[PDB]
Amino acid sequence: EHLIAQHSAIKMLHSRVKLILEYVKASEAGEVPFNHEILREAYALCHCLPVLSTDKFKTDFYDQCNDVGLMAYLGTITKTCNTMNQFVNKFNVLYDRQ
Amino acid sequence: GLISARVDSHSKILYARDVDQRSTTFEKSLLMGKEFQRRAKAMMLRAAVLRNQIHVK
Amino acid sequence: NLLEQFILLAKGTSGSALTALISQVLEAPGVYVFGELLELANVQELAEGANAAYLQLLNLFAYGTYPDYIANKESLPELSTAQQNKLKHLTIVSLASRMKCIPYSVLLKDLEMRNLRELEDLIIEAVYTDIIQGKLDQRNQLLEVDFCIGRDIRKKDINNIVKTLHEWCDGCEAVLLGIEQQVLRANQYKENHNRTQQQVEAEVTNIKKTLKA
Amino acid sequence: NMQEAQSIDEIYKYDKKQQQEILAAKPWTKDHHYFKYCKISALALLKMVMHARSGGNLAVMGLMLGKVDGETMIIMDSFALPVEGTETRVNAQAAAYEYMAAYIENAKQVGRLENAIGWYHSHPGYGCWLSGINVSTQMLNQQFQEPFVAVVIDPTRTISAGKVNLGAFRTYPKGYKPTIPLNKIEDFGVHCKQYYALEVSYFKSSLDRKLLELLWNKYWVNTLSSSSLLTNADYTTGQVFDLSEKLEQSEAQLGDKLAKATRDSCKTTIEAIHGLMSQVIKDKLFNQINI
Amino acid sequence: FSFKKLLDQCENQELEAPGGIATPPVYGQLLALYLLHNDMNNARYLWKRIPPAIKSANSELGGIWSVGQRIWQRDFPGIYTTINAHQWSETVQPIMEALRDATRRRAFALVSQAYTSIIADDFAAFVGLPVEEAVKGILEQGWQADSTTRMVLPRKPQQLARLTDYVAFLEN
Amino acid sequence: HIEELLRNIRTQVLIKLIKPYTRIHIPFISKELNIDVADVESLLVQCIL
Amino acid sequence: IIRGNQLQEFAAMLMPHQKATTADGSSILDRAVIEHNLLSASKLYNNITFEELGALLEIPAAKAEKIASQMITEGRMNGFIDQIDGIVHFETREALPTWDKQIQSLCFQVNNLLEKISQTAPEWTAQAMEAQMA
């Protein structure tokens, strides 16, 4: 459920990107009249792909990743504790009485 | 632990040090997880040995 | 639409009137992209003759930057102060286009400025014309730009933009394939766990039925 | 994959015999806190919300249709009433009852096999709680119609904050008590000890999900870049705080609550892992192109 | 990298034997390689395992155990003076040079990590080389020196698959 | 009661001036507060305690 | 960043009462222009030193710091002031929200370019879309 919403959005975003690339290719081929206004905005968009490659952003992202990883650890352990308690309760009546 | 401070005994300065919450919490969580894993490793072996009913004679 | 008006007034003009119109255009505030004017047939026709220096000036202000002008000062004609200002702004735009965090040293060396105050005044004057949206830093000496208007594009960089767009499409496709594979793995794992639970339930029900004999 | 009745649509079945057996056995007569779960259909919530907002600041209400499965009240429809009411007080003199039984009789033929399972009321901007006379209303509603629950809606809080202010409440019989505190009386009524709330969850159909997923998304920097895993930081802090008391009560019980506590913790950990996955996919999409 | 497979084959040859005693070259190679990997406990246990006759027959094992004891005591000038005091055979020659330059690199790393201000004489003793070329060299790698006082101040030197596995494991 | 006075006013001035800053010099406080550095330290330690 | 060497026209058409000084060493117009300049500098900057700030606001030196301190504690501009290094911080971003705002800008640019290209040549865009959706 959490993944399919991302998948559809990325699919149609990629379709938009493909349409833009198709128009650029057609303009290069000369099929459409050569417009000197769309290409400049497209060039700016092309120059605006590598967003925020600074070291501070990388440090913050890795901090977030580590925090979420330890969150997952604390929460995997509490569920293996539930499994352990269930196993202990099951075993406390079959092989060893009281 | 009454005073959270350190002594620099060259210029004779008593500095105050504040604890970082993140590092302390991460270290103690990892240590607790390791202790729990060791405890599980021991007790499941104990369960096996109780299953086979081993005692000295 | 100042550029459209200027090119409309430049439709039939030729000779010294054309050069005067060019000089007027190159100093008019608010015009920072010389795209449509250069593509006009007469402007390219002025290549022949003794007025080719003006065509070189237009080519330099369309794609080149300040270092190109200062390296070719001997041949190019002199220009008024507003035209140096426009060239400096275009050079700032070109520098910000490549990297999004401009060190102060690089900008100062490229623009040939003396002190920090003059550079800061020039850059804030450039920002005031809505060309770029940036933040000045004094502690780290690092200009931080966010949005920059695209400059003129020659008929040679279309391959570059096509390549970049193709790379972006390929990345999107790879991400989609990975997403599909991960969701399929999750579904099959859930199904396998459910079948295992069903099998153990069937076994326990069978033994319960057998026990009551 | 629409013809088969999946686990999502299996709740859309009205078994007359099972409901008759449930209503005849009446397991609720012994256990006072017998009912805990309240599942509600989507369209009931939609009609309720649009009726609450259509009346503006004037209180509106209605009867809801549903069934009971064990300890869960499953509500499948909402309904409006032709009443005249002010901001705080309503009457529902004769028009509501002339359009209540008639509506049931009309619905008996279209295909609506459900009956009265409770009523919902809109409290415009003064909390989700049972009023001093509403508690008596549910008193005499439950005394003879045992399968029943009172639903309270706050239109103003929902329209302003952005979260559904919904509350399902059932009251204890007169005489069952288990000086008033100063923390459980502002979010509840002065008779808070005479009623309790029930966990509320919603369900939908497979075609509902299919239509929703194709309705409209956009939502690139609205959903796919919205400071996820961070907007509900206060919610997560509150949850991780109250899991401490939940686990300590479970441990005291050991010295069952533990399964509920583990489910509660699993919900939060799964949610924040989903947030991390979204952040990772964003990073792989945008940041790592054009090195 | 060949040292790892050499250790593996030598250990295998030692494990299987007509009487548990291999050739003296095998013992020498094994002990030298244990010294190279800075694994002192296993080297000492191997030395104690050697029968008295074979170890007394050859002084090569005695010298290599002497340099092993020198490593044990962590006396670096002793390391640099013992390793070049005896003439060694061919079967052990091309491993002790690796031992020497590995210990030199380890000493450089230790000095760069622990010491902040060290007298040039002590640093030269740790390295095992004359003062002058060590001083110029550390000048090139970027360690500021100090004349007159003669002091050295070294400067200290895919995901989504795992996430979906985690979420699948927790969802049960 | 002029010693209890002439003290609340200076404390109020210190509180008002200390709001926007995050690290300052003691003599800068001494200049505007119109009192020696030792008394500035005494007022600051009392306010902190 | 309006400066004092092109504001004489406004000062000329000022009534005597509206222009009369407050007896603080500067005119009221000089008060207003300096406060506006300081507020404007608070937007398109991140952190600035007093030596550089002593050029935007004219000003000798520390009086700019006094004005900056006066601006704060009145609910007008945000940011704390250092005095050991003599550097004032206006406001800083925290990386991830800047990433979200860059996503804002990039995707709005994509959408606007799509709208423009669809409005430019409807036939070609329709052809390309109907071929892609096949």
Side-chain angles (χ1 to χ4, degrees):
Chain A
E1 291 180 351
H2 190 91
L3 207 62
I4 198 72
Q6 310 270 8
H7 173 279
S8 187
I10 302 312
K11 160 70 52 161
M12 84 153 77
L13 181 137
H14 157 267
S15 87
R16 302 290 180 88
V17 179
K18 193 64 159 98
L19 186 44
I20 289 295
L21 173 58
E22 286 288 342
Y23 175 76
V24 176
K25 182 74 64 59
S27 299
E28 182 181 2
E31 199 272 333
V32 286
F34 174 68
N35 190 11
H36 203 73
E37 210 279 336
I38 299 310
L39 272 71
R40 289 195 256 116
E41 297 196 3
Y43 200 44
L45 189 139
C46 181
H47 278 329
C48 199
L49 277 296
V51 159
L52 284 186
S53 72
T54 78
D55 57 353
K56 180 70 176 177
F57 163 79
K58 279 265 183 262
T59 301
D60 198 2
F61 182 61
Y62 281 123
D63 172 69
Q64 185 64 257
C65 292
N66 284 317
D67 196 6
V68 182
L70 189 151
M71 162 286 278
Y73 191 90
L74 284 187
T76 294
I77 178 176
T78 189
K79 193 267 288 182
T80 196
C81 286
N82 188 359
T83 306
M84 192 95 87
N85 183 211
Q86 212 62 34
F87 163 77
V88 162
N89 265 316
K90 292 276 174 267
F91 174 81
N92 215 9
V93 294
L94 177 56
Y95 273 31
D96 169 69
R97 301 138 312 286
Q98 58 80 28
Chain B
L2 281 176
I3 304 183
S4 174
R6 324 285 165 139
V7 176
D8 187 300
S9 193
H10 191 216
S11 303
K12 297 295 172 157
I13 297 187
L14 180 54
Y15 280 109
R17 183 173 296 277
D18 49 6
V19 298
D20 289 331
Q21 305 191 23
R22 289 181 60 253
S23 301
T24 299
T25 51
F26 285 5
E27 190 270 332
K28 66 172 53 178
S29 162
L30 211 58
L31 188 147
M32 183 278 288
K34 156 84 161 152
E35 292 180 353
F36 160 78
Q37 204 177 199
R38 207 268 297 283
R39 211 172 275 112
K41 212 167 280 195
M43 162 285 267
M44 182 178 71
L45 168 65
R46 183 176 166 76
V49 74
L50 266 294
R51 175 178 294 173
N52 210 2
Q53 191 46 274
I54 301 305
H55 49 65
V56 76
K57 300 178 181 68
Chain C
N1 298 355
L2 276 297
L3 179 59
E4 278 88 1
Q5 168 207 339
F6 271 124
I7 197 171
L8 189 151
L9 277 296
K11 181 63 70 177
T13 61
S14 306
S16 87
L18 190 141
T19 68
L21 191 141
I22 298 299
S23 183
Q24 198 201 343
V25 168
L26 271 296
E27 70 182 340
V31 174
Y32 285 111
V33 59
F34 294 71
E36 281 85 9
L37 177 57
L38 183 50
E39 83 191 358
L40 194 148
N42 306 321
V43 191
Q44 209 53 256
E45 192 270 331
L46 272 295
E48 59 92 19
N51 299 352
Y54 284 143
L55 185 65
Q56 304 314 86
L57 189 138
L58 274 296
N59 280 105
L60 191 144
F61 289 162
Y63 320 113
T65 43
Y66 186 76
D68 205 87
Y69 166 67
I70 197 66
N72 204 2
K73 181 79 161 65
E74 54 268 0
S75 70
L76 304 160
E78 88 289 334
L79 300 98
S80 307
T81 62
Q83 294 178 356
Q84 281 75 244
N85 204 2
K86 268 169 68 171
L87 182 63
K88 287 175 183 290
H89 295 346
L90 259 61
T91 306
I92 284 170
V93 176
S94 175
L95 274 178
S97 179
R98 264 64 157 210
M99 64 184 73
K100 292 207 178 300
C101 285
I102 287 165
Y104 263 51
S105 307
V106 183
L107 171 68
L108 195 144
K109 180 67 174 66
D110 218 332
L111 260 59
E112 295 179 357
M113 282 329 278
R114 274 71 161 290
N115 290 318
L116 277 300
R117 168 65 186 175
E118 282 96 337
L119 180 60
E120 287 180 51
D121 171 90
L122 180 65
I123 196 166
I124 65 182
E125 187 151 358
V127 167
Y128 287 151
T129 66
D130 268 338
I131 293 172
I132 54 180
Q133 313 301 117
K135 299 283 193 70
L136 265 72
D137 283 31
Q138 201 70 33
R139 262 270 320 280
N140 315 319
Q141 290 86 18
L142 188 141
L143 169 76
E144 175 182 357
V145 292
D146 286 6
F147 169 76
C148 52
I149 184 167
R151 290 186 62 193
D152 281 324
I153 175 167
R154 325 204 71 179
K155 309 301 282 289
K156 290 170 69 176
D157 300 332
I158 316 171
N159 301 328
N160 187 276
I161 189 173
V162 164
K163 199 188 57 52
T164 302
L165 269 290
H166 203 58
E167 183 176 0
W168 199 6
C169 295
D170 268 8
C172 288
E173 211 79 7
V175 165
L176 287 175
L177 267 294
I179 289 310
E180 285 291 327
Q181 190 176 1
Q182 293 325 300
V183 69
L184 182 63
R185 287 185 65 251
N187 289 318
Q188 68 92 30
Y189 184 88
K190 182 144 204 63
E191 183 265 356
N192 195 1
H193 179 259
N194 291 336
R195 303 300 61 61
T196 299
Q197 183 60 42
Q198 211 78 354
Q199 190 263 358
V200 69
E201 211 274 347
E203 286 296 327
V204 65
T205 61
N206 182 24
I207 196 63
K208 198 44 188 165
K209 181 178 75 175
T210 294
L211 191 140
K212 307 307 298 191
Chain D
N1 58 353
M2 283 73 74
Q3 66 267 11
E4 72 264 13
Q6 295 94 359
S7 174
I8 305 171
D9 302 331
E10 70 182 1
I11 208 157
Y12 286 85
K13 298 182 183 293
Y14 187 87
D15 187 18
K16 179 65 70 178
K17 303 288 107 177
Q18 211 261 341
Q19 291 304 131
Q20 283 174 352
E21 294 143 14
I22 289 181
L23 262 72
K26 294 176 73 65
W28 39 83
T29 55
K30 294 301 299 312
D31 195 23
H32 292 171
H33 73 294
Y34 174 58
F35 294 121
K36 164 162 202 202
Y37 287 165
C38 189
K39 204 78 168 174
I40 305 169
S41 66
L43 191 74
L45 160 75
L46 269 76
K47 284 210 295 191
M48 182 278 288
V49 164
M50 61 79 71
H51 193 232
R53 191 37 78 218
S54 72
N57 266 350
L58 317 173
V60 298
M61 73 291 291
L63 183 78
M64 64 184 73
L65 316 178
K67 66 164 71 70
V68 287
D69 281 14
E71 66 265 9
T72 307
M73 271 77 77
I74 317 168
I75 311 155
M76 283 73 74
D77 204 24
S78 281
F79 184 63
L81 283 172
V83 297
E84 286 180 346
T86 194
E87 176 84 31
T88 176
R89 178 224 42 78
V90 302
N91 45 11
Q93 58 269 26
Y97 305 138
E98 288 165 351
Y99 186 65
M100 184 177 177
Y103 166 63
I104 285 186
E105 284 164 52
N106 267 14
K108 289 266 187 56
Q109 309 203 44
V110 294
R112 297 294 305 161
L113 306 173
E114 285 89 358
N115 281 319
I117 211 66
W119 57 271
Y120 75 92
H121 186 273
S122 83
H123 291 83
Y126 41 89
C128 290
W129 64 293
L130 286 191
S131 287
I133 58 168
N134 280 324
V135 62
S136 300
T137 306
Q138 205 277 330
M139 284 289 121
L140 76 163
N141 284 154
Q142 176 179 350
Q143 74 183 358
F144 294 151
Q145 305 165 329
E146 275 83 8
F148 183 77
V149 62
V151 160
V152 167
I153 308 95
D154 199 301
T156 303
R157 295 183 192 277
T158 304
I159 193 66
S160 68
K163 226 180 211 173
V164 184
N165 283 258
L166 194 70
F169 293 99
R170 265 179 61 98
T171 69
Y172 302 125
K174 178 51 68 184
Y176 186 65
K177 326 294 189 192
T179 63
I180 44 166
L182 271 300
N183 52 283
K184 287 294 294 157
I185 56 158
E186 70 266 12
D187 63 358
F188 275 53
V190 74
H191 314 112
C192 52
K193 300 285 103 176
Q194 329 290 338
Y195 72 96
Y196 71 99
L198 292 89
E199 191 170 3
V200 170
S201 52
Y202 315 106
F203 73 96
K204 80 179 61 160
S205 71
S206 59
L207 185 68
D208 196 1
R209 159 259 192 189
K210 285 189 285 292
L211 284 156
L212 282 163
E213 84 188 78
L214 60 88
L215 173 62
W216 172 259
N217 51 293
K218 194 172 186 181
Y219 290 166
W220 324 106
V221 73
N222 318 112
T223 297
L224 270 73
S225 173
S226 65
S227 189
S228 181
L229 173 145
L230 302 170
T231 65
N232 56 7
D234 71 308
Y235 165 56
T236 61
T237 56
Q239 208 51 48
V240 307
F241 266 120
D242 74 4
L243 271 294
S244 181
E245 287 107 318
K246 189 70 174 68
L247 272 296
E248 84 178 355
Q249 259 168 39
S250 166
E251 195 272 337
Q253 179 198 6
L254 266 293
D256 211 292
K257 262 162 165 177
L258 191 151
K260 281 82 175 176
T262 52
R263 177 180 308 111
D264 196 359
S265 178
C266 202
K267 209 57 184 182
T268 314
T269 185
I270 291 281
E271 181 72 31
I273 297 169
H274 286 170
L276 172 61
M277 185 180 288
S278 181
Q279 286 269 325
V280 168
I281 202 54
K282 290 155 60 179
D283 178 22
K284 295 177 79 68
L285 280 151
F286 291 105
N287 196 16
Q288 277 166 234
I289 317 294
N290 295 113
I291 62 170
Chain E
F1 293 0
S2 161
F3 300 96
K4 324 305 178 293
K5 64 176 70 67
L6 180 62
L7 172 63
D8 189 358
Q9 64 196 98
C10 287
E11 184 66 29
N12 282 36
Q13 276 171 55
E14 162 61 33
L15 192 143
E16 61 76 13
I21 304 105
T23 61
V26 166
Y27 288 165
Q29 273 209 311
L30 274 167
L31 194 152
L33 192 152
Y34 281 158
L35 273 294
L36 189 143
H37 274 320
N38 196 55
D39 193 355
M40 296 301 104
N41 305 303
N42 277 292
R44 176 188 305 104
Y45 286 176
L46 173 60
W47 167 256
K48 286 202 281 193
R49 175 157 93 245
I50 309 285
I54 176 166
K55 67 183 278 183
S56 67
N58 314 108
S59 64
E60 189 155 309
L61 202 64
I64 202 79
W65 177 233
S66 196
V67 71
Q69 285 183 353
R70 292 291 94 191
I71 290 276
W72 184 10
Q73 285 195 356
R74 279 180 179 168
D75 197 343
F76 278 91
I79 301 304
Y80 292 113
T81 191
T82 300
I83 200 167
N84 299 319
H86 182 74
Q87 303 293 343
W88 293 97
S89 46
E90 172 51 45
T91 183
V92 298
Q93 210 284 327
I95 194 167
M96 281 195 318
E97 312 314 313
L99 187 138
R100 165 209 298 178
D101 72 344
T103 52
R104 189 167 280 143
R105 155 198 310 117
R106 194 188 74 187
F108 274 118
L110 185 48
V111 168
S112 86
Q113 160 75 266
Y115 277 92
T116 303
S117 68
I118 176 65
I119 297 169
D121 291 331
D122 198 2
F123 167 81
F126 281 167
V127 176
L129 298 184
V131 292
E132 69 275 16
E133 79 263 18
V135 168
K136 294 154 271 283
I138 68 168
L139 276 168
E140 291 91 8
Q141 292 83 18
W143 295 0
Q144 307 99 337
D146 200 332
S147 184
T148 59
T149 61
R150 294 226 319 280
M151 301 265 268
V152 170
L153 275 81
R155 48 148 292 279
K156 327 183 92 193
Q158 40 194 329
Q159 191 82 40
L160 74 164
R162 290 166 141 92
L163 269 299
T164 195
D165 200 352
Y166 285 146
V167 70
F169 165 69
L170 292 175
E171 66 183 1
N172 206 12
Chain F
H1 289 298
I2 67 150
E3 193 59 32
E4 166 71 22
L5 284 173
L6 188 148
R7 181 66 61 86
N8 304 286
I9 177 70
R10 285 185 306 207
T11 300
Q12 266 284 327
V13 162
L14 202 55
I15 292 170
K16 184 253 204 174
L17 190 72
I18 208 60
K19 181 168 166 60
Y21 296 78
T22 196
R23 53 183 298 164
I24 66 184
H25 290 282
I26 293 301
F28 178 75
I29 284 296
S30 176
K31 193 167 306 306
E32 294 188 358
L33 195 63
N34 274 292
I35 202 162
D36 306 85
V37 287
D39 280 333
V40 159
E41 280 190 7
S42 299
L43 274 296
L44 272 174
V45 65
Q46 185 177 3
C47 290
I48 285 175
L49 274 184
Chain G
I1 197 67
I2 186 69
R3 289 180 177 90
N5 54 348
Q6 67 261 23
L7 212 49
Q8 299 89 12
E9 49 259 41
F10 200 98
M13 41 187 299
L14 280 183
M15 294 182 286
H17 176 79
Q18 193 195 351
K19 167 70 165 201
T21 183
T22 307
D24 47 47
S26 62
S27 307
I28 191 56
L29 174 71
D30 288 329
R31 291 291 308 167
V33 67
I34 292 300
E35 304 306 327
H36 166 247
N37 277 330
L38 192 54
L39 191 143
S40 163
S42 181
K43 284 221 297 211
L44 55 89
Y45 291 167
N46 204 346
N47 46 7
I48 59 171
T49 318
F50 290 128
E51 61 93 19
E52 175 63 32
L53 186 50
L56 291 161
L57 302 164
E58 300 303 317
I59 200 67
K63 193 174 180 298
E65 160 70 337
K66 172 63 171 33
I67 296 312
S69 178
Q70 184 84 327
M71 281 305 327
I72 321 168
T73 74
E74 288 178 353
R76 323 286 267 282
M77 63 179 287
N78 301 349
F80 58 95
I81 291 175
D82 290 339
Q83 203 171 0
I84 312 308
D85 305 330
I87 292 155
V88 294
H89 291 107
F90 288 142
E91 59 92 19
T92 78
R93 293 202 291 264
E94 49 262 24
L96 299 176
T98 315
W99 195 28
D100 304 296
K101 192 168 71 175
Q102 291 311 107
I103 295 305
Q104 285 274 350
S105 175
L106 163 66
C107 196
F108 286 168
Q109 186 74 254
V110 172
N111 193 0
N112 283 359
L113 190 56
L114 176 74
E115 164 175 290
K116 283 286 298 301
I117 195 63
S118 185
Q119 275 196 2
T120 293
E123 52 262 21
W124 184 96
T125 66
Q127 183 275 333
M129 183 91 169
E130 78 203 9
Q132 187 183 11
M133 295 298 102

